JSON list of C-alpha atoms in Angstrom, two decimals:
[
{"chain": "A", "resi": 1, "resn": "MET", "atom": "CA", "xyz": [50.05, -40.11, 74.15]},
{"chain": "A", "resi": 2, "resn": "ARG", "atom": "CA", "xyz": [49.86, -40.20, 77.99]},
{"chain": "A", "resi": 3, "resn": "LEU", "atom": "CA", "xyz": [53.61, -40.16, 78.94]},
{"chain": "A", "resi": 4, "resn": "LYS", "atom": "CA", "xyz": [56.10, -38.53, 81.38]},
{"chain": "A", "resi": 5, "resn": "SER", "atom": "CA", "xyz": [57.67, -34.99, 81.14]},
{"chain": "A", "resi": 6, "resn": "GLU", "atom": "CA", "xyz": [61.08, -36.35, 79.92]},
{"chain": "A", "resi": 7, "resn": "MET", "atom": "CA", "xyz": [59.38, -38.60, 77.34]},
{"chain": "A", "resi": 8, "resn": "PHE", "atom": "CA", "xyz": [57.19, -35.68, 76.09]},
{"chain": "A", "resi": 9, "resn": "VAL", "atom": "CA", "xyz": [60.15, -33.31, 75.40]},
{"chain": "A", "resi": 10, "resn": "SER", "atom": "CA", "xyz": [62.06, -35.99, 73.40]},
{"chain": "A", "resi": 11, "resn": "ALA", "atom": "CA", "xyz": [58.89, -36.96, 71.42]},
{"chain": "A", "resi": 12, "resn": "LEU", "atom": "CA", "xyz": [58.10, -33.22, 70.77]},
{"chain": "A", "resi": 13, "resn": "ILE", "atom": "CA", "xyz": [61.50, -32.87, 69.06]},
{"chain": "A", "resi": 14, "resn": "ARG", "atom": "CA", "xyz": [60.58, -35.76, 66.65]},
{"chain": "A", "resi": 15, "resn": "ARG", "atom": "CA", "xyz": [57.25, -33.93, 65.91]},
{"chain": "A", "resi": 16, "resn": "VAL", "atom": "CA", "xyz": [58.99, -30.67, 64.80]},
{"chain": "A", "resi": 17, "resn": "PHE", "atom": "CA", "xyz": [61.59, -32.56, 62.64]},
{"chain": "A", "resi": 18, "resn": "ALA", "atom": "CA", "xyz": [58.57, -34.39, 61.07]},
{"chain": "A", "resi": 19, "resn": "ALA", "atom": "CA", "xyz": [57.34, -30.82, 60.14]},
{"chain": "A", "resi": 20, "resn": "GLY", "atom": "CA", "xyz": [60.90, -29.95, 58.88]},
{"chain": "A", "resi": 21, "resn": "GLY", "atom": "CA", "xyz": [61.66, -27.66, 61.86]},
{"chain": "A", "resi": 22, "resn": "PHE", "atom": "CA", "xyz": [64.31, -27.97, 64.66]},
{"chain": "A", "resi": 23, "resn": "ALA", "atom": "CA", "xyz": [64.33, -28.69, 68.47]},
{"chain": "A", "resi": 24, "resn": "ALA", "atom": "CA", "xyz": [66.68, -29.21, 71.46]},
{"chain": "A", "resi": 25, "resn": "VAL", "atom": "CA", "xyz": [66.23, -29.67, 75.29]},
{"chain": "A", "resi": 26, "resn": "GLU", "atom": "CA", "xyz": [67.82, -26.61, 76.98]},
{"chain": "A", "resi": 27, "resn": "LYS", "atom": "CA", "xyz": [66.62, -26.93, 80.64]},
{"chain": "A", "resi": 28, "resn": "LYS", "atom": "CA", "xyz": [65.91, -30.21, 82.49]},
{"chain": "A", "resi": 29, "resn": "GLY", "atom": "CA", "xyz": [63.66, -30.62, 85.61]},
{"chain": "A", "resi": 30, "resn": "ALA", "atom": "CA", "xyz": [61.50, -33.53, 86.97]},
{"chain": "A", "resi": 31, "resn": "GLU", "atom": "CA", "xyz": [61.15, -36.55, 84.59]},
{"chain": "A", "resi": 32, "resn": "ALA", "atom": "CA", "xyz": [57.66, -37.84, 85.61]},
{"chain": "A", "resi": 33, "resn": "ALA", "atom": "CA", "xyz": [55.70, -34.95, 87.23]},
{"chain": "A", "resi": 34, "resn": "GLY", "atom": "CA", "xyz": [57.70, -31.97, 85.85]},
{"chain": "A", "resi": 35, "resn": "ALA", "atom": "CA", "xyz": [56.44, -28.82, 84.09]},
{"chain": "A", "resi": 36, "resn": "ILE", "atom": "CA", "xyz": [57.42, -28.25, 80.39]},
{"chain": "A", "resi": 37, "resn": "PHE", "atom": "CA", "xyz": [57.96, -24.77, 78.88]},
{"chain": "A", "resi": 38, "resn": "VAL", "atom": "CA", "xyz": [58.73, -24.73, 75.13]},
{"chain": "A", "resi": 39, "resn": "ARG", "atom": "CA", "xyz": [59.79, -21.62, 73.13]},
{"chain": "A", "resi": 40, "resn": "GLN", "atom": "CA", "xyz": [58.81, -21.53, 69.41]},
{"chain": "A", "resi": 41, "resn": "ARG", "atom": "CA", "xyz": [61.32, -19.56, 67.35]},
{"chain": "A", "resi": 42, "resn": "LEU", "atom": "CA", "xyz": [59.77, -17.91, 64.29]},
{"chain": "A", "resi": 43, "resn": "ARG", "atom": "CA", "xyz": [62.40, -17.16, 61.57]},
{"chain": "A", "resi": 44, "resn": "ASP", "atom": "CA", "xyz": [60.31, -13.97, 61.03]},
{"chain": "A", "resi": 45, "resn": "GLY", "atom": "CA", "xyz": [62.23, -12.64, 64.08]},
{"chain": "A", "resi": 46, "resn": "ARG", "atom": "CA", "xyz": [59.60, -13.42, 66.78]},
{"chain": "A", "resi": 47, "resn": "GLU", "atom": "CA", "xyz": [59.24, -16.09, 69.51]},
{"chain": "A", "resi": 48, "resn": "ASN", "atom": "CA", "xyz": [56.46, -17.80, 71.51]},
{"chain": "A", "resi": 49, "resn": "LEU", "atom": "CA", "xyz": [56.34, -19.57, 74.92]},
{"chain": "A", "resi": 50, "resn": "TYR", "atom": "CA", "xyz": [54.21, -22.58, 75.92]},
{"chain": "A", "resi": 51, "resn": "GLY", "atom": "CA", "xyz": [53.49, -24.26, 79.28]},
{"chain": "A", "resi": 52, "resn": "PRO", "atom": "CA", "xyz": [51.38, -27.07, 80.90]},
{"chain": "A", "resi": 53, "resn": "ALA", "atom": "CA", "xyz": [47.64, -26.13, 80.68]},
{"chain": "A", "resi": 54, "resn": "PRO", "atom": "CA", "xyz": [45.17, -26.22, 83.72]},
{"chain": "A", "resi": 55, "resn": "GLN", "atom": "CA", "xyz": [44.46, -29.98, 83.45]},
{"chain": "A", "resi": 56, "resn": "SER", "atom": "CA", "xyz": [41.31, -31.42, 85.13]},
{"chain": "A", "resi": 57, "resn": "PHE", "atom": "CA", "xyz": [43.55, -33.56, 87.42]},
{"chain": "A", "resi": 58, "resn": "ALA", "atom": "CA", "xyz": [41.32, -35.47, 89.89]},
{"chain": "A", "resi": 59, "resn": "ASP", "atom": "CA", "xyz": [43.67, -35.15, 92.95]},
{"chain": "A", "resi": 60, "resn": "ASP", "atom": "CA", "xyz": [46.68, -35.06, 90.49]},
{"chain": "A", "resi": 61, "resn": "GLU", "atom": "CA", "xyz": [45.73, -38.33, 88.67]},
{"chain": "A", "resi": 62, "resn": "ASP", "atom": "CA", "xyz": [45.65, -36.79, 85.14]},
{"chain": "A", "resi": 63, "resn": "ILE", "atom": "CA", "xyz": [49.31, -35.55, 85.45]},
{"chain": "A", "resi": 64, "resn": "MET", "atom": "CA", "xyz": [50.59, -39.09, 84.57]},
{"chain": "A", "resi": 65, "resn": "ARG", "atom": "CA", "xyz": [47.24, -40.97, 83.94]},
{"chain": "A", "resi": 66, "resn": "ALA", "atom": "CA", "xyz": [45.96, -38.57, 81.20]},
{"chain": "A", "resi": 67, "resn": "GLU", "atom": "CA", "xyz": [47.47, -36.56, 78.31]},
{"chain": "A", "resi": 68, "resn": "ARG", "atom": "CA", "xyz": [47.90, -33.11, 79.94]},
{"chain": "A", "resi": 69, "resn": "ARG", "atom": "CA", "xyz": [47.59, -30.62, 77.01]},
{"chain": "A", "resi": 70, "resn": "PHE", "atom": "CA", "xyz": [49.68, -27.42, 76.74]},
{"chain": "A", "resi": 71, "resn": "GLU", "atom": "CA", "xyz": [48.85, -23.70, 76.47]},
{"chain": "A", "resi": 72, "resn": "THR", "atom": "CA", "xyz": [50.45, -20.55, 74.99]},
{"chain": "A", "resi": 73, "resn": "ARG", "atom": "CA", "xyz": [52.32, -18.51, 77.70]},
{"chain": "A", "resi": 74, "resn": "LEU", "atom": "CA", "xyz": [53.65, -15.86, 75.22]},
{"chain": "A", "resi": 75, "resn": "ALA", "atom": "CA", "xyz": [53.11, -15.22, 71.45]},
{"chain": "A", "resi": 76, "resn": "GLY", "atom": "CA", "xyz": [54.82, -12.89, 68.90]},
{"chain": "A", "resi": 77, "resn": "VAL", "atom": "CA", "xyz": [57.30, -11.69, 71.55]},
{"chain": "A", "resi": 78, "resn": "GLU", "atom": "CA", "xyz": [61.18, -11.73, 71.78]},
{"chain": "A", "resi": 79, "resn": "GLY", "atom": "CA", "xyz": [63.78, -13.97, 73.54]},
{"chain": "A", "resi": 80, "resn": "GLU", "atom": "CA", "xyz": [64.09, -11.47, 76.44]},
{"chain": "A", "resi": 81, "resn": "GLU", "atom": "CA", "xyz": [60.32, -11.90, 77.15]},
{"chain": "A", "resi": 82, "resn": "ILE", "atom": "CA", "xyz": [60.76, -15.73, 76.99]},
{"chain": "A", "resi": 83, "resn": "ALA", "atom": "CA", "xyz": [63.69, -15.81, 79.48]},
{"chain": "A", "resi": 84, "resn": "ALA", "atom": "CA", "xyz": [61.91, -13.16, 81.65]},
{"chain": "A", "resi": 85, "resn": "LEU", "atom": "CA", "xyz": [58.96, -15.57, 82.26]},
{"chain": "A", "resi": 86, "resn": "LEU", "atom": "CA", "xyz": [61.27, -18.66, 82.52]},
{"chain": "A", "resi": 87, "resn": "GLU", "atom": "CA", "xyz": [62.87, -16.57, 85.31]},
{"chain": "A", "resi": 88, "resn": "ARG", "atom": "CA", "xyz": [59.49, -16.26, 87.15]},
{"chain": "A", "resi": 89, "resn": "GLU", "atom": "CA", "xyz": [58.46, -19.95, 86.67]},
{"chain": "A", "resi": 90, "resn": "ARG", "atom": "CA", "xyz": [61.94, -21.31, 87.68]},
{"chain": "A", "resi": 91, "resn": "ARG", "atom": "CA", "xyz": [61.79, -19.21, 90.91]},
{"chain": "A", "resi": 92, "resn": "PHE", "atom": "CA", "xyz": [58.58, -20.90, 92.15]},
{"chain": "A", "resi": 93, "resn": "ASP", "atom": "CA", "xyz": [59.15, -24.31, 90.44]},
{"chain": "A", "resi": 94, "resn": "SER", "atom": "CA", "xyz": [62.58, -25.08, 88.81]},
{"chain": "A", "resi": 95, "resn": "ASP", "atom": "CA", "xyz": [61.19, -28.61, 87.86]},
{"chain": "A", "resi": 96, "resn": "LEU", "atom": "CA", "xyz": [60.18, -27.07, 84.47]},
{"chain": "A", "resi": 97, "resn": "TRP", "atom": "CA", "xyz": [62.01, -28.13, 81.30]},
{"chain": "A", "resi": 98, "resn": "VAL", "atom": "CA", "xyz": [62.81, -25.75, 78.41]},
{"chain": "A", "resi": 99, "resn": "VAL", "atom": "CA", "xyz": [62.90, -26.92, 74.76]},
{"chain": "A", "resi": 100, "resn": "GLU", "atom": "CA", "xyz": [63.82, -24.51, 71.92]},
{"chain": "A", "resi": 101, "resn": "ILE", "atom": "CA", "xyz": [61.78, -25.49, 68.82]},
{"chain": "A", "resi": 102, "resn": "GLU", "atom": "CA", "xyz": [62.59, -23.50, 65.61]},
{"chain": "A", "resi": 103, "resn": "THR", "atom": "CA", "xyz": [59.53, -23.76, 63.32]},
{"chain": "A", "resi": 104, "resn": "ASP", "atom": "CA", "xyz": [56.77, -21.76, 61.52]},
{"chain": "A", "resi": 105, "resn": "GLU", "atom": "CA", "xyz": [53.83, -23.92, 62.70]},
{"chain": "A", "resi": 106, "resn": "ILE", "atom": "CA", "xyz": [52.93, -25.20, 66.22]},
{"chain": "A", "resi": 107, "resn": "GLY", "atom": "CA", "xyz": [49.60, -27.13, 66.01]},
{"chain": "A", "resi": 108, "resn": "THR", "atom": "CA", "xyz": [51.03, -30.24, 64.25]},
{"chain": "A", "resi": 109, "resn": "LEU", "atom": "CA", "xyz": [54.06, -30.55, 66.61]},
{"chain": "A", "resi": 110, "resn": "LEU", "atom": "CA", "xyz": [52.45, -29.36, 69.92]},
{"chain": "A", "resi": 111, "resn": "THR", "atom": "CA", "xyz": [48.71, -29.18, 70.81]},
{"chain": "A", "resi": 112, "resn": "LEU", "atom": "CA", "xyz": [47.44, -26.19, 72.91]},
{"chain": "A", "resi": 113, "resn": "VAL", "atom": "CA", "xyz": [44.18, -25.20, 74.75]},
{"chain": "A", "resi": 114, "resn": "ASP", "atom": "CA", "xyz": [44.91, -21.51, 73.88]},
{"chain": "A", "resi": 115, "resn": "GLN", "atom": "CA", "xyz": [45.50, -22.04, 70.13]},
{"chain": "A", "resi": 116, "resn": "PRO", "atom": "CA", "xyz": [42.54, -23.41, 67.96]},
{"chain": "A", "resi": 117, "resn": "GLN", "atom": "CA", "xyz": [42.10, -27.04, 66.78]},
{"chain": "A", "resi": 118, "resn": "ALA", "atom": "CA", "xyz": [43.24, -28.19, 63.29]}
]
């Protein structure tokens, strides 16, 4: 669905609970035009990071006129690595959100340009 940043984070949480996993909005930024950085928590002991992909936004139309897909920032890393990048991204643009999702799988509950199609 083509929706806002605030509406995406809330909907993402319902996707992970539909897969049996968990989610919660940690950081809050801009509701409409904001960035979204989600950390997947593998019960294996590892964590991932996701962010807004390079969308083909025709003079920033596709930000709120098209479904901007996500990408994988980090994968098979730890929580220090996650917060270390969230540190870099907040510095330049604190309008990012952070959602902790605790799940095994990602593709069903968040689609990525980095990760392959189902």
